[PDB]
Structure formats: structure tokens, C-alpha cells
Ligand binder design. Structure first.
Ligand SMILES: *[C@@H]1O[C@H](CO)[C@@H](O)[C@H](O)[C@H]1NC(C)=O
Ligand SMILES: *[C@@H]1O[C@H](CO)[C@@H](O)[C@H](O)[C@H]1NC(C)=O
Ligand SMILES: *[C@@H]1O[C@H](CO)[C@@H](O)[C@H](O)[C@H]1NC(C)=O
Ligand SMILES: *[C@@H]1O[C@H](CO)[C@@H](O)[C@H](O)[C@H]1NC(C)=O
Ligand SMILES: *[C@@H]1O[C@H](CO)[C@@H](O)[C@H](O)[C@H]1NC(C)=O
Ligand SMILES: *[C@@H]1O[C@H](CO)[C@@H](O)[C@H](O)[C@H]1NC(C)=O
Lengths: 119, 123, 106, 119, 119, 123, 106, 123, 106
């Protein structure tokens, strides 16, 4: 169910991404709320597109983890932690990660264009 | 004019490692793709490796894919090559070449525009 | 590799033909067969790029052509200063970027 | 033209998908109608994305046809039937198919993530 | 910065596509303006999707350049020209190009479907 | 009935070129995939090439990928094949065949429904 | 290629079995092994399509079957008009579309 | 402790089929990838096949891609292998192994953590 | 396969070195060369995982290392109970998952 995995581990919660994805979209004040909700949804979809993740819910990238953002083990993050705790721990680093993801995709797009240009 | 000047090693025992560094001037380094072309003392020339103008893409001959790494620093106007496991068949003069590729928004190359003088790598 | 005769010669002032034959995946399908002139002890210089085009600084005595899977270089007005080793280089796709021929001594 | 293939066979109509796709998007009451039309469009695009079909008009999947949904031959469906008749015949099975498509894509995304994790 | 490449060459400006892409989305009269801005954004995303470019900022296609649209050299377009000048020069040909891109993608989708149908 | 009639050349020197043109009638040409199947004078038959119903997709045997081109004009009800570099191993009767593929929305074929009489290509 | 005996025979009115054996990537994994009957001087005709199905116009004396990686054609009620070269053709995937066997003379 | 117990057949004629079934206990079965590793009576060991923790992905050695199928039932805590066309070169002890892969959100394995006792497959 | 000497020996209480050499695509590029100890009649046990790490339950006399394309296992304090066949196993990519060496009898 919607948000039922919120208290579950990140691993267990990663298997229910479509439930929340479906639920995100599902006078003047209500029109403003609906237009803003659409704009937010589209901003998140645009941001995924910029990263090359436009059609994926689980999207792997070419940006390495710095370890300064979090030096936890994979078992500590995926088995012993929830998504709310993880989001809180790295709330100060999401703009750095987003910037790196955008730069990495821009480099990937240029590399793909150049590879396609080889006769 | 355009000049490419090789710096490198000499005799290295079989199975070791050697790195070449090629300086370039007379043109914008970051605007051209670079290649390394090898000529054995008694043979003609063969292409060894190609790097893009930005350095993101590298290509190698199958026989050297696991031994040679090509890289470029566009701020230092430097093209370098590093080779490991130097086999007896790899002894040759290694020439820097400008050209061999372009990044889609430029006219086609697929040829080498400029050549250096060549470093001699022996074993 | 591309195959060309190991030796070409002629009287000064006369034309000569240098040619190399490859396969359909090397010379036939791609119109990118360049030619280089290498003097002993010197690095090769670019003489012809593309099938028929010449770089700036090279005289018009050097002219390229292609037919079928065979590429040719015609050198008219042969000079003593042209006695150099000539090579052809063909683009052969994404897996095999360049294939060079053996040299011919003029 | 828009909906001109509605009376044509499913095969013939499958070649005009971009005409309708383009035409789908092309005071308070009109703003509500426009916001709702956008929300519907986005729900259909989100649903395609969940299935891994975010950029395609004709998207092949890994969900087998049960034959209980319809036991017709391919010639009966594609050459002797229209899309309106087909939609009516399986109107009671689209939620089962949608659920299977979502589950299949979730499995595909996990498999792709695990394949990319092999060094 | 946003539109900072407007006076730069097409090549230099092609490296800043994410800045404008991010900035494009970022009572009654304002709701109409916001709904229309969303509809325009979605029309451009739908149009890219129709061409098979739904997740890319730089998307290569299978439509050849006719040379009647513009007979300029690549250096004249990418090194000696800006995007505003280019857009002005081919403003009379964008509907032809868009039509060809749509037809080419429709052919590509049918070819992909038929290739996937080979057992 | 359904008929396929081959038109083509005869003796061509080694390394030359030859084009076959196959006319068809009795069925909708654009509804079926077409193939060319080759039979040497003393051997059985082998598949050479396959073209889709629309003509967008072509498939070839590895030994002929660089020599044969298959194309179809659905307005002229014509299937043609063009071959270059005719080798001595390519002398044979070339038969038109209807079938061998279907475009996803049709029942599976993977067999040939109709055959022509065959053009004889020799060297 | 698929391997079948080069020659099959029998008395008129009796049944005969023609079979060809391939590998797991040709006959085993794909249930698409057709059979063709070629009279000398004539183009082959389709006799069997799919493993067991017959086309319209062909009599029911021709019946296909498959077991393991071996495909068979049983011809009952042998007639003088059946003395023709028979071939099997198997679908072998996307890289190798069709593999034909050698012929058997009946 | 962790235990893996093989059940399987014995002597099977060349070209036949045989299925192994491996029971496991002492750990969560669905949390680990499983492999089969083969040891000929007079040789060392070689990897034969790998299955993921969920069972969706299977990998095989090229020499067995067309003969062996690996599957796992996570509700029955059972890992089974089925082989067809048993060749003379396939006679060996077949060991169950836990490890060899992990599903991206777990630490890397690329080694085998636990071993069974081994079923003997002969021909 | 990976190559190691077929036989290793030494006096009890002394150290021994067991090593196997592979290629750049097997041991060199991937830091995943495990070691197993197999007693005759018994299944192999895990002794070393990763290049240098040991599993729980194994004593610290077994220590791994890697240099170039050669992996080694040093066994200090040799005991009579260590006379077993040792194998190395390297991860070799996605097409070839694991490559085992031949055994060495200690
Ligand atoms: C909540 O914690 C308990 C701890 O015993 C665990 O068993 C349970 O699965 C957790 N709930 C969810 C939804 O993960
Ligand atoms: C990691 O983050 C720190 C702090 O921002 C930075 O100094 C360091 O360079 C980063 N390292 C990498 C590899 O990004
Ligand atoms: C309508 O039916 C007729 C039947 O003769 C057919 O020829 C025609 O193509 C159909 N129209 C469309 C738009 O498919
Ligand atoms: C087909 O649908 C019926 C009815 O819902 C169901 O019982 C059956 O299991 C389904 N079969 C498959 C293969 O999905
Ligand atoms: C504007 O033109 C000058 C010409 O000298 C050039 O150097 C500069 O880069 C241009 N500005 C931009 C933003 O491209
Ligand atoms: C190029 O455009 C002209 C004018 O519209 C047209 O006549 C011509 O056929 C076009 N050529 C191609 C190859 O599209």
C-alpha cells in the first residue's frame, strides 16, 4: 500500500516504487494546488530526464560515491536503515549529487553523439 | 607552425612499463582528436590508438587493448600514452598524430593532419 | 593490411602510379583512403586525405583516385625529391579504425 | 486524419498512432477541463513509464497472452477487427493486464540492476 | 547562466542545454499562463517522444539533411553561427523536418517490432 | 494461381555484377515477406537472403553480407536482388520464394509458401 | 547444414521414413522444421510447414514429426509420382535464419 | 550451522537427461546467490552455473549453455539443476555452492561461501 | 584456466607459498581471487575471499596477496592437517564468470 514501506528497510522499500509513483499523480485555491502538483511532478520527471533516467524508477549512473557524503556500509544503508533516515542523513548533499549527475549525463550525451559519428 | 615533440623512455626489459608524453603547439590542442601510430624499424606504419578531442573516448587495436592506455590533458596541451607488459613485438618508433576523428559537429577527418618526430621504444 | 607493390620507379619527369588493394569493408564501402609520404629518417607527411583531396602545402603533382576496392595515387612530374616510402591508410569501421598498407619505395 | 482509422482494422490503424497522439494534447470550468486533460495525459504517460514504455507508441513486453482474455487468431484481431471492437471485448481484463505489465517491468528493472552490478 | 550562450556559437551553446531545459519549467490570468506553459512544455516533450527522443537533449536521427534547407558547411553552422541566426535561416523548413522525423520514427518502430518478432 | 517469374542475366566473368528481378502475381505482394534461395547445379538448396514485407529490413547469410543487396518495390510488385564480386562458389539457380517471415501482427511463417522457377547465374 | 541419408526407397504402396538430424540450436529449440519436395528440373514445392502442419493442396500421405533434435517425414502409400528430392529446412535463430539439409532421392 | 544436501541420479546413458536437487538450511535461502561447481574424478574444480538470489538471472559456461538449466524455488529452499544430452566429458561430482554473486544492494561476493557434499553424475 | 605448480611441500612449522598466474582479464583487472582448501573425499572449504580477506572460522596462518597478474597464498606454521589440495578462483568478467586453477597437493 501507499507509503506502507516507509518504516521498512531501504531494500524492502525499493520493491514498492510503483505504488508511490502511481499515487503521486492520481476554485482558485484548488486549481493552484493542482497546477503546482503537476509542475512539481514534471520538475521531478525533467530532472530524471536530465540525468538520463526519464523512463526508469531504479536508474544506475556513472557518478561514484564520494564516501564523504556517507561512509556507511551497504548493509547499514540497505538492511539496517529506512529511506526517511537516509534522506535526513544526506539532506545536505543532494545538490552536489544532482550537479554531478547532470554533468555526467551531459558528458555521456556528448560521448554518444561522437560515437554515433564514427562511420 | 604546428609542432609535436615526443618525450619518453628507452630500453625497458620485457614485461615492464613505459610512458610517453607528447607536447604540442601551433594549434588549439582541444580542437583535434589525437592518435598514436607505430612503425617497427623494418616495417611500415600501423595505427595503435585514438583519443577524442575531449579525452572521454579512447579506441585501441585489439592486440593492445589490455596493454595501452591513451590519455590527454587539454589544459597542459599534453597527449600521453602508457603501456604495460611490453612484448618483443612492440618495439618500434611511436609517432604522435593530430587527426583521425572529429566530434560530430566538425567536418570528417579519418586521416592524420600532423605528425611528430617519434619516440623509440625498444626491448 | 593493404597490399601494394613493394617497389615503384620511373624516369624523372614522368608519371608513376602507386596503388593498394583492400577488401569491401576497408576501401570499397568507405571513401576515406589517405596517402602519406615518408622520407627515411623522417616522420610521414600527409599527402592526400579523403579519396581525392590534397592538403594545403602539397603540390598538385600528387593526385588520388579510387576504383572498386583499389585506391591509387598518381605522381606526375617525378622529381628526385620524391624518392620516399609511400603508404595508404584506409578507414575500416568502428572495430578496426585504420588499416595501413605496406610501403613502396620510390 | 484524427480518428480516421477508427473504422479500419487494428493493423491499418496501428500505422496512424502519431495522429491521435499529437491530437490528445494539442474561466474556472475551462481551467478545470484543461488541468484534468493534462492530468489524464500524464497518467497515461506515467503508466507507460511504469511498464518501461515511456518513449514508445508501439511497445513490446514480456507478459504472455493468457488466451483466456481472448482466444482469437491474429488474423481475426489484426485483419478482421477494429480497435473499438477489441477494446470492448477485453474491457473486463485491462486491469489484470496492467497489473502484470507493472510486475513484469519491476522484475526487469531489478534484473537490469543486478546485471549492471557484475564487475 | 540561463540564455548566456545565446550570443555564442552553436557548438559552444550546445554544451549548456540543461540550463535552459531546467529554466523552461522552473488569479485566472496567472492560472491560464501556468497551464499554457505546462501545455507547451508537454507538447515539446511529446514531439520529442514521437521522434524517439523522449529522454535526450541531443538526439541523433535517421533523417538526412536535404541541403536545400541550408547548404552551409559544418564550420559555418557550428563555429561561425549562433542558434538565433540558424533558427531564422531555417524557420521556413521546420515543419518539413518535423514531418520527416515523425515518419522516420514510425518506420523505426515498425522495424523494431518486426525484429523483435523473430524467434 | 500464384506465380513468380524470374528475369536475369547469364554468364558473367568472375568479380563482376549481376541483378535479378522477380515479378509476382496472384496475391498481394506487400502482404508477404520474400526470400532468395540458391541451389548449385549438383547440390541441394540453401537460403541466401530475406526481405520483410515492407522492405525496411534485410537479412543475409554471413558469406554474402558484403556482396548481395535485396530490395523490393511494392508498387511494381517486383522483388530484385543485386550481387557484386561474383565468386566461383556463387554459380547456381536462384529461386524467388514467398514466405520466411511475418511482421509481428501476422501468424508466424519461418517457411516458404511459394516458389518461382529460378534464374541461372553462372561464371 | 542438416544431415539426412542420401537415398531412401521402398515398394509402391508402402510407407517410407525420411529424417534429418540437427543440433539443439536448429531443430531442438525451434518448432519450425518445414519439408520440401523437388522434382528434377522443377522448383521445390512446400510439403510440410511447422513441425506437423500441411499446406492446402498436399495430400494427407505426407506427415511430419519431431523428436529430440531429429525431424522426420513419413510418406505413406508411396506412389511413382513421389520419386523426388526431399529437403528439410529448420529455422535457426536471428543470426542464421534457415538451415537446409542435403537432399535424399526417393 | 549451514548445510547443503544434494539429491540426484547415478549412471545415465550418453545423451540422456538427469536432474539434481539441492536442499539448504541454516541461512535465509533467498538472500544468497547459488552456483553449481563441477569436479571431474581426477581433476580440480570448475564453475558450471550461477543463479541469482531471486532466480530471475542465470549464467552458464559456454560449453554447457545448450545443455544445463539452473533454477531455484525460494519457498521450498531448493536449488535444482537439470542437464540434457549428457556427454562423456560431463561425468563429475557436482557441488552446490552458496555465493558467487549479489544483487547490487549487498556487498560484493564473487566467491563461494558455503559448499555441499556433492552428487556424483556418471555416464 | 589458471596455472600453479602441481605440488608444494615443506617441513611442519615452516611457511610455504602457493601461487597461480593468470592473464590481465582474470587476476590483474579484478581484485577477486579467492582460495579453497579441499581435503581428499571432502568438499572444498573457503579459505580466502577477495585478494586479502579471510572468512570467519579460518586461522590467521592463511594469508593472501596479489602482485601483477599472479595471486599468492602464504601458509605459515604448516601443520599435518594442512595437507590438502588448494585451488585459486578468479572472477573473469561477465562472459566468463569464474576461472579455477589446477590443484596443488600440500
Ligand atoms: C518492523 O520491525 C520489526 C522488528 O521485529 C520487523 O519484523 C518488521 O518487518 C518491521 N516492519 C516493516 C514494515 O518492515
Ligand atoms: C568529496 O567531498 C569533499 C567535500 O566536499 C571534497 O573536498 C572532495 O574533493 C570530494 N571528493 C570527490 C572524489 O568528489
Ligand atoms: C470500410 O470497409 C470497406 C469494405 O469494402 C473497405 O474496403 C474499406 O477500406 C473500409 N474503410 C476503412 C477506412 O478501412
Ligand atoms: C488465465 O486467466 C484465468 C482466469 O483469471 C486464470 O485462472 C489463469 O490462471 C490465467 N492463466 C495465466 C497463464 O495467467
Ligand atoms: C563574443 O565575441 C567575441 C569576439 O572576439 C568572442 O571572443 C566571445 O567569446 C563572444 N562571446 C561569447 C559569449 O561567445
Ligand atoms: C529537398 O527539398 C526540395 C524542395 O522542397 C525537394 O524538391 C527535394 O525533393 C528535397 N530532396 C530531398 C532528398 O528530400
Amino acid at each position: 500500500g501507499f507509503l506502507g514501506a516507509a518504516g521498512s528497510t531501504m531494500g524492502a522499500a525499493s520493491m514498492t516504487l510503483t505504488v508511490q509513483a502511481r499515487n503521486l499523480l492520481s476554485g482558485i485555491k484548488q486549481l493552484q494546488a493542482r497546477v503546482l502538483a503537476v509542475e512539481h511532478y514534471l520538475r521531478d520527471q525533467q530532472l530524471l530526464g536530465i540525468w538520463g533516467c526519464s523512463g526508469k524508477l531504479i536508474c544506475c549512473t556513472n557518478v561514484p560515491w564520494n564516501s564523504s557524503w556517507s561512509n556507511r556500509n551497504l548493509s547499514e544503508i540497505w538492511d539496517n536503515m529506512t529511506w526517511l533516515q537516509w534522506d535526513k542523513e544526506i539532506s545536505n548533499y543532494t545538490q552536489i549529487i544532482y550537479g554531478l549527475l547532470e554533468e555526467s549525463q551531459n558528458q555521456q550525451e556528448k560521448n554518444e553523439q561522437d560515437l554515433l559519428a564514427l562511420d | 607552425e604546428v609542432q609535436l615533440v615526443e618525450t619518453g623512455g628507452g630500453l625497458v626489459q620485457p614485461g615492464g612499463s613505459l610512458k610517453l608524453s607528447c607536447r604540442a603547439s601551433g594549434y588549439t590542442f582541444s580542437s583535434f582528436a589525437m592518435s598514436w601510430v607505430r612503425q617497427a624499424p623494418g616495417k611500415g606504419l600501423e595505427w595503435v590508438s585514438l583519443i577524442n578531442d575531449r579525452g572521454g573516448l579512447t579506441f585501441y587495436v585489439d592486440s593492445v587493448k589490455g596493454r595501452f592506455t591513451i590519455s590527454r590533458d587539454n589544459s597542459k596541451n599534453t597527449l600521453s600514452l602508457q603501456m604495460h607488459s611490453l612484448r618483443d613485438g612492440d618495439t618500434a618508433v611511436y609517432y604522435c598524430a593530430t587527426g583521425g576523428m572529429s566530434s560530430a559537429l566538425q567536418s570528417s577527418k579519418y586521416y592524420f593532419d600532423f605528425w611528430g618526430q617519434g619516440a623509440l621504444v625498444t626491448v | 593490411a593493404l597490399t601494394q607493390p613493394p617497389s615503384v620507379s620511373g624516369s624523372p619527369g614522368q608519371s608513376v602510379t602507386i596503388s593498394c588493394t583492400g577488401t569491401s569493408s576497408d576501401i570499397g564501402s568507405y571513401n576515406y583512403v589517405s596517402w602519406y609520404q615518408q622520407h627515411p629518417g623522417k616522420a610521414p607527411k600527409l599527402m592526400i586525405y579523403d579519396v581525392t583531396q590534397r592538403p594545403s602545402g602539397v603540390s598538385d603533382r600528387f593526385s588520388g583516385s579510387k576504383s572498386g576496392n583499389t585506391a591509387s595515387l598518381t605522381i606526375s612530374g617525378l622529381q628526385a625529391d620524391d624518392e620516399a616510402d609511400y603508404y595508404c591508410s584506409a578507414y575500416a569501421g568502428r572495430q578496426t579504425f585504420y588499416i595501413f598498407g605496406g610501403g613502396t619505395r620510390l
